[PDB]
Design an enzyme around this catalytic site. Structure first.
Site, mmCIF file in Angstrom:
data_model
loop_
_atom_site.group_PDB
_atom_site.id
_atom_site.type_symbol
_atom_site.label_atom_id
_atom_site.label_comp_id
_atom_site.label_asym_id
_atom_site.label_seq_id
_atom_site.Cartn_x
_atom_site.Cartn_y
_atom_site.Cartn_z
ATOM 1 N N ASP A 209 0.829 -1.196 0.000
ATOM 2 C CA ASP A 209 0.000 0.000 0.000
ATOM 3 C C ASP A 209 0.871 1.257 0.000
ATOM 4 O O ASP A 209 1.421 1.680 1.022
ATOM 5 C CB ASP A 209 -0.968 0.039 1.169
ATOM 6 C CG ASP A 209 -2.102 1.043 1.069
ATOM 7 O OD1 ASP A 209 -1.884 2.091 0.469
ATOM 8 O OD2 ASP A 209 -3.167 0.829 1.713
ATOM 9 N N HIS B 171 -9.866 -2.606 -7.952
ATOM 10 C CA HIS B 171 -9.560 -1.301 -7.374
ATOM 11 C C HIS B 171 -8.616 -0.485 -8.263
ATOM 12 O O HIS B 171 -8.897 0.703 -8.492
ATOM 13 C CB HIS B 171 -9.028 -1.461 -5.948
ATOM 14 C CG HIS B 171 -8.738 -0.176 -5.231
ATOM 15 N ND1 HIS B 171 -9.680 0.805 -5.009
ATOM 16 C CD2 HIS B 171 -7.612 0.249 -4.599
ATOM 17 C CE1 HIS B 171 -9.108 1.804 -4.318
ATOM 18 N NE2 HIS B 171 -7.849 1.497 -4.065
HETATM 19 C C1 HEM Z 1 -10.534 1.216 1.214
HETATM 20 C C2 HEM Z 1 -9.275 1.072 1.642
HETATM 21 C C3 HEM Z 1 -8.194 1.237 0.627
HETATM 22 C C4 HEM Z 1 -7.159 0.329 0.529
HETATM 23 C C5 HEM Z 1 -6.896 -0.814 1.517
HETATM 24 C C6 HEM Z 1 -6.419 0.679 -0.636
HETATM 25 C C7 HEM Z 1 -5.360 -0.127 -1.004
HETATM 26 C C8 HEM Z 1 -4.704 0.011 -2.189
HETATM 27 C C9 HEM Z 1 -3.686 -0.873 -2.626
HETATM 28 C C10 HEM Z 1 -3.134 -2.113 -1.923
HETATM 29 C C11 HEM Z 1 -3.241 -0.329 -3.788
HETATM 30 C C12 HEM Z 1 -2.110 -0.956 -4.597
HETATM 31 C C13 HEM Z 1 -0.741 -0.428 -4.110
HETATM 32 C C14 HEM Z 1 -0.694 1.072 -4.424
HETATM 33 O O1 HEM Z 1 -0.426 1.444 -5.590
HETATM 34 O O2 HEM Z 1 -0.935 1.936 -3.544
HETATM 35 C C15 HEM Z 1 -4.018 0.850 -4.095
HETATM 36 C C16 HEM Z 1 -3.860 1.677 -5.214
HETATM 37 C C17 HEM Z 1 -4.534 2.902 -5.424
HETATM 38 N N1 HEM Z 1 -5.546 3.345 -4.601
HETATM 39 FE FE1 HEM Z 1 -6.250 2.549 -3.051
HETATM 40 N N2 HEM Z 1 -6.969 1.753 -1.249
HETATM 41 C C18 HEM Z 1 -8.052 2.157 -0.548
HETATM 42 C C19 HEM Z 1 -8.922 3.186 -0.809
HETATM 43 C C20 HEM Z 1 -8.708 4.055 -1.825
HETATM 44 C C21 HEM Z 1 -9.520 5.156 -2.151
HETATM 45 C C22 HEM Z 1 -10.780 5.530 -1.489
HETATM 46 C C23 HEM Z 1 -8.972 5.822 -3.241
HETATM 47 C C24 HEM Z 1 -9.395 7.047 -4.008
HETATM 48 C C25 HEM Z 1 -10.460 7.858 -3.838
HETATM 49 C C26 HEM Z 1 -7.786 5.044 -3.548
HETATM 50 C C27 HEM Z 1 -6.917 5.359 -4.590
HETATM 51 C C28 HEM Z 1 -5.908 4.564 -5.096
HETATM 52 C C29 HEM Z 1 -5.107 4.972 -6.299
HETATM 53 C C30 HEM Z 1 -5.196 6.183 -7.200
HETATM 54 C C31 HEM Z 1 -4.255 3.939 -6.579
HETATM 55 C C32 HEM Z 1 -3.276 3.976 -7.846
HETATM 56 C C33 HEM Z 1 -3.679 4.107 -9.403
HETATM 57 C C34 HEM Z 1 -2.581 3.506 -10.345
HETATM 58 O O3 HEM Z 1 -2.371 2.262 -10.003
HETATM 59 O O4 HEM Z 1 -1.913 4.119 -11.339
HETATM 60 N N3 HEM Z 1 -7.680 3.982 -2.697
HETATM 61 N N4 HEM Z 1 -4.923 1.054 -3.090
#
Ligand code: HEM
Ligand code: HEM
Ligand code: HEM
Ligand code: HEM
Ligand code: HEM
Lengths: 305, 306, 305, 306, 306, 305
Positions: free
Chosen positions: F146, F219
């Site tokens: 994350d 996601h």
């Molecule tokens: C609900 C709990 C959440 C968890 C556990 C979570 C977890 C993760 C994980 C494991 C990744 C992959 C590793 C990373 O690139 O950071 C990810 C990617 C991402 N998350 Fe989340 N996330 C959450 C909520 C959100 C929310 C609410 C948003 C936006 C409003 C968000 C936006 C993003 C974005 C923009 C990416 C990257 C886009 C790209 O891959 O080029 N996340 N998240």
């Protein structure tokens, strides 16, 4: 009585060097063995305290006889080929072992240099491996490896020859075997399936509950209870190694025990089967290409030659 | 600037050098991989920050460039010039791609290299694979401190990065690699005083020899070259020792980035062919080059998009 | 029976403080000695376990008599002056010694402050030295310093008084000398020659083999074997100090042993010579300007006053 | 174009301060050394990367400057102005050159000092030599946290570096040094409440005392100055404790860099002479200045050019 | 030896304290867990070496002991004795099981706690759960250094481990826990001089107050007790602060191991009830006990064998 | 011109999230505190350098902004937009101030939070207080890495900082917070292969799934947005796990900085409401938002006034 550095902290680099003695070279080797203590420190001292440099010098059966005046370790013999229905545990030449470890590779490479320097001529190399730990104690199959080793007194108890053979109390019995993995195959598995092969969970490294754990699983066939009724224990330090170019992916196995019966029993189980198991499932992905056995004396023993 | 690949890297303590050729057919698979290389750096690296400092720099050969992209070439890009000297020969070996992978732990390099060669199964042939390590006090295999006079900060920016002079490819650099093997038996035969005469610095204290003492045939002498302006013309190195104790192989893997190869190549001419003053760099009397390849390392933008 | 922190881990900084006792301070000193153990902890505890603060307190011969009555340690005497052909080892005043060590200077200094705070008025400072680790355990001559010191239980048995003087078991005998180097001259030698003075390789810190090692070399004259053939060992923690302003470059020498007969032997060989060596070549570049002998009691002996 | 000296060094945990005078006719030997100082930093420092953080800043006094160069002088450069206050006296002591040497280990400082004073033996005379260390948790000898309100990042760039206002010497700074000795017996006689009244912050938690309560003869009171520019006037300090327990000497070595001395000098005037509403800085009732010197620390390339 | 649980633990920076009761017919599920707890320590901890320093110490209450095992009882094991003092009251709250989880990072504690309470879902009821954290220089919530006079090495072995006196349970210990809440508003009202009079040590330098001047109602006074053996009577503590700024709660979680509770209990009698020369420990005027529970923490072999 | 608050902060492993409302008539007390917050960061933080890495970012809600200042409002600042989706609802909860406090150690966060809420006792009401901890290998509560694809260096500057488009407030940013709770029982029901299909990356190696195989309800799918020109639209996250084992609460606290909220808001629309491709982000089938608030975090200069 004081032993060599069998029980080391976790160390994240190592060189395993295996050699054979040309005839003629047995006075050159007597000489190196007396000094090997002091070369550990020549190289290691200036790197305190991060270095954690340590060398464990072991001798094979054949070599013992050529080299030494009198009586022999109880347990010492040639490694025993295991010619099983499916997998074969081979038996390779190996007169001398240097198990070199530290927190960085160059420290090992410096000591191996200074050693082979004194041997150039008197020996012939068989095998040389340059090992490294993954950043969270994983092996090449991606599992945490090291989890269930013994500590403290348990380790002092399960590794060192004591009163049972007391001219060499402080010795240990090392087995080595180099294994090459079929990664194409292995990575073809689901994680759930891979857990079934090892006996623990991949990510959290927890043991599979006693009724969901296959008996062909590695952790099943190597949990082995004595006459004593107690668990029987070895100490491992398996180092991944390899080459991306040569598609070579490896785990170098080393197993210290106070007697070889212990290690050897685990290996019968693995290659030959039990009551309820053909062979260890891990060997369906891992080919042994070495095998030797050595006694690793007390340190008092080497200084005096 | 355009955002460039991680050429300006800290001291890192381990590296993998991976050099390959492109098989017939492989063109497609390589373009796919170059678009993704950026993102594999991060996958593998991110979870070990900041202890980790994994960096991968990807470069492309002359012949390979033409097979892969159409349109402009970088101004300086050519096959490495073989140098057939009186005594010493700098040889030219094949390489279409280069991965200079560096971190503070070897396993991080190896995990990334696995993922890369994993995605190129089929498409290439490995030519050279080296795993290097720094000796514990930044010294190389001859036992001298290695990297002292490298530029940093903005002076480095000025010395390695393509700018206005070929603005299409601003952010790029020109990497030259050579794998050298050393004759240590011979080298450890010299007194330290003599070894310093070969290198041009003090062994233990790593201080330059004074201008009046330093031989003309010393390494540091022949690789200090002055510009049109008389300002020193600089490159960036991260020579890494490697080898094998069993097969008596002790090496220094040479790698050198510059804004134009005319610079790196000049230094080589002086080393291998000599000047009026010096027959050849005394270091070659103990070091044998067994590879040689020239590559261009683009700005990371150029890969991110195709 | 529990001892002072003589076997300390490798530390990078040290204060050496030597004082004499003013007449009528005897009381104030005994008060301080009972508390010294507890100031170690006060100051040191909050910077654990990086801290590695240790204070070892020793007592001179004449001072011992002024402070206690009854039996004296067997070996305790004023330091023996050595009036050699060439080199003279001098004796300087010293009733108390504080060998304070840690990983940071501030910890040493904070402890030294709190001790001299409780003795301001009772004593007169004779010598105060702030030392430091150079790079990678090298001293001011640029060689690695500490390498052949004993470790583990070999050290236990070579420094700690035992059965031979059972009243004081847990004690040790520290000898200190402040040495200054004529660097001027030392940097005039080639490295080949400098190795001939010390007896080891400068850069790799490997012993010279016995077939090349001069008998006037430092390592030569300070290897002594006993009647029973075994090596006689001490423990050293030589620390460089100096001041670049006053072209003062030094190595502060300190040597603990279970009896001074050992330390003193090595000195006799260094200053006076053997059959085959006029004196230790190291003294041709090193001048002793202090000399003091102290007994460092078991910790329970101090706690209990 | 211009690169400045390592003035904006991180927090380091050890330092040597060396101040010397130039003997008659030593001017030549010094110019030689100034051209090379940058190179000795690297010799000694490079092999102990990246933990080392060895930095040397070299500054030059007013009278020495005229002896060494003419050409332009920096706008602000003059001998330290002695301040003979009602009670407390800030004295002026001799000093042609300053070396403010800093790293994470003392031996690195001392090794550099050795190499510098090695090359200057004969040509100079040491006036002051101080080995300083960090106390615990960035505290000084009075047991308060020391460095808290120093400006950081680009605000530091703005406050310390000569710029357009004297463009010849952009990249330079003005260092003032004073060696202070404390009367600890007296100081440890105060309650903590009272000591906070002297300093102007809380001992343990290092929080500022409110306007509600902070004495105007407190140190933090007297050293907060606002300009005509309405903005706060900021300097950069790296006060280092030193001492010896044997000779009851407990000290703070003061050093203060600024873009102009008018700033540093103002703070001093307020400390020693007083304001409308305060006699002198309460801190001086426990601290005695025994040195005082002003120096200009040029851009690093300016020393390269000799 | 037998192997004991991880009572003598290095300096750890974080801890979770978990206290539960065993529901009706949970006895089976708990025995299952106890046999495995040693090995969950290793699962979770091993891969994060050597930074981790993860340790879990598992204890059992008096009433709970009888439900789970019969066979011998540990000599000392009883319900926590309520002490209803002149002024201050030490309370008793329920607790069948205790998990004293410690490491250098909180997430490792939490990961272990999760795996434990995962295997007990259904079978227990949580009474108390506390996430604790050390201040960076081993200070507690009152701002004093906390842990200093704890025994170490084999003097700790001597103070904490059941031995020959009850050889059935050798390797065990007796943990008493109490959760304290502080009225910091009140505490921060004192001068430091006064606060030292409450504790019996110097705030800043952490030195004992002299026997002349240390109040007999001070904490350090009332908790130094000498036995028949002439010897000082020692325990091992690992007080951890906790709290919440939202709910104005600031706390010190107390935990104290000893070879017999008669020791720990004595100190409490002195604290809450008073001596000849002290009404109560001054520290209670700022600290309110809101839990209280007594547990036996067995030899580690005793758990493995179920 | 402007120095901004510590938004581009190093990877830190501990955090306190504090959300409050301003009581009636407390407007005064708050303005005083905001002027000083800069300097409390340094009081508490300075003595722990450089390990400490203590940083506080202070943000202000839409309703609250109007109470406190007159003059310009930030262009983008509005109350959080509630999203009532087909299946999952993103809620709006109250919040006038935010303190996003981060360091390497929790005590540092707590000491600073103490000093802040100390100076606001009486003037505010706490709505939400969360103690977060990053797992040792940058994983969150679902056991995936994350933070991986966050922008860094200059790309971060470009994506998070108000610039010319609203130059009154250049140096500012827009933070959105949501507190999420997970159904772990449900999540640990999935095979790893399935869980990767929810997230869109590999669990163990953290490599992106290729464009062909990645579900468009995953996601990573729904939160990759490109702008009008087809350059990727990025935010900065610092998701922190929290929980309580006793009360079976296992959580990820979400925080997202961007140069305008319309970016963060877009990602949410796709997550909660769906595209044509996707009903909604599969991650919500395991994660329930129980807070939601939007804040503007000014340039740091703006608080100094
Ligand atoms: C609900 C709990 C959440 C968890 C556990 C979570 C977890 C993760 C994980 C494991 C990744 C992959 C590793 C990373 O690139 O950071 C990810 C990617 C991402 N998350 Fe989340 N996330 C959450 C909520 C959100 C929310 C609410 C948003 C936006 C409003 C968000 C936006 C993003 C974005 C923009 C990416 C990257 C886009 C790209 O891959 O080029 N996340 N998240
Ligand atoms: C390719 C070769 C091998 C690999 C990849 C491997 C991997 C593993 C792994 C992942 C574990 C579980 C974690 C742990 O407890 O370490 C383990 C456990 C174990 N392995 Fe191996 N292993 C290999 C060869 C061997 C051999 C040759 C032996 C003995 C002759 C051995 C003996 C053991 C023992 C005794 C245990 C622990 C039993 C217990 O959990 O009580 N392994 N191995
Ligand atoms: C005056 C400055 C001195 C310097 C700079 C110095 C330095 C060294 C060095 C570099 C070594 C070899 C590395 C090692 O073996 O630790 C050494 C060895 C030793 N030194 Fe010294 N030393 C000094 C004085 C003394 C004195 C006064 C004594 C004894 C009274 C002494 C006793 C020893 C011993 C016993 C050895 C090791 C013998 C063995 O190799 O088995 N040194 N010294
Ligand atoms: C013995 C000499 C000195 C000692 C021990 C000393 C110590 C301190 C201490 C403890 C602080 C409070 C913490 C901090 O903000 O760094 C401080 C602040 C300061 N000192 Fe000093 N100091 C000394 C001399 C000086 C001198 C000679 C100057 C200037 C000429 C100076 C300028 C300052 C400034 C400007 C501040 C901060 C103003 C603000 O709050 O915005 N110090 N000093
Ligand atoms: C209520 C919160 C408590 C706090 C905040 C606290 C704090 C402290 C502190 C600051 C010290 C001095 C430093 C040291 O030696 O650790 C200390 C010492 C000690 N505490 Fe406590 N303590 C508390 C409760 C208790 C309780 C309930 C006991 C025993 C029941 C206890 C037993 C001791 C002992 C035995 C000592 C050291 C005695 C010696 O100096 O030889 N503490 N405590």
């Amino acid at each position: 009585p004081e032993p060599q550095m069998v029980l080391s902290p976790l160390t994240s680099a190592a060189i395993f060097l295996v050699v054979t003695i040309d005839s003629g070279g047995e006075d050159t080797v007597r000489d190196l063995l007396s000094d090997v203590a002091s070369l550990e420190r020549a190289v290691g001292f200036r790197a305190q305290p991060d270095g954690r440099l340590s060398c464990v010098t072991g001798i094979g059966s054949e070599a013992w006889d050529r080299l030494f005046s009198g009586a022999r370790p109880a347990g010492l013999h040639p490694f025993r080929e295991l010619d099983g229905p499916v997998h074969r545990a081979v038996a390779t030449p190996g007169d001398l072992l240097f198990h070199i470890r530290a927190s960085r590779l160059d420290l090992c490479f410096a000591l191996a240099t200074e050693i082979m320097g004194r041997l150039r001529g008197a020996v012939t190399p068989q095998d040389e491996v340059h090992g490294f730990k993954y950043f969270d104690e994983r092996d090449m199959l991606g599992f945490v490896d090291g989890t269930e080793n013994p500590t403290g007194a348990a380790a002092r108890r399960a590794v060192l020859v004591g009163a049972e053979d007391p001219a060499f109390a402080g010795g240990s019995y090392a087995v080595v075997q180099k294994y090459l993995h079929d990664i194409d195959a292995w990575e073809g598995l689901s994680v759930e399936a891979q857990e079934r092969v090892i006996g623990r969970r991949k990510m959290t490294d927890v043991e599979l509950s006693d009724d969901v754990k296959p008996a062909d699983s590695h952790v099943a066939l190597t949990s082995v209870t004595g006459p004593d009724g107690s668990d029987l224990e070895i100490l491992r330090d398996n180092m991944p190694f390899g080459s991306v170019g040569r598609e070579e992916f490896g785990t170098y196995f080393i197993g210290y025990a106070r007697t070889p019966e212990v290690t050897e029993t685990m290996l019968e189980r693995m290659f030959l089967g039990t009551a309820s198991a053909p062979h260890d499932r891990i060997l369906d992905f891992s080919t042994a290409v070495t095998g030797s056995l050595f006694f690793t004396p007390a340190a008092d023993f080497l200084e005096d030659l």
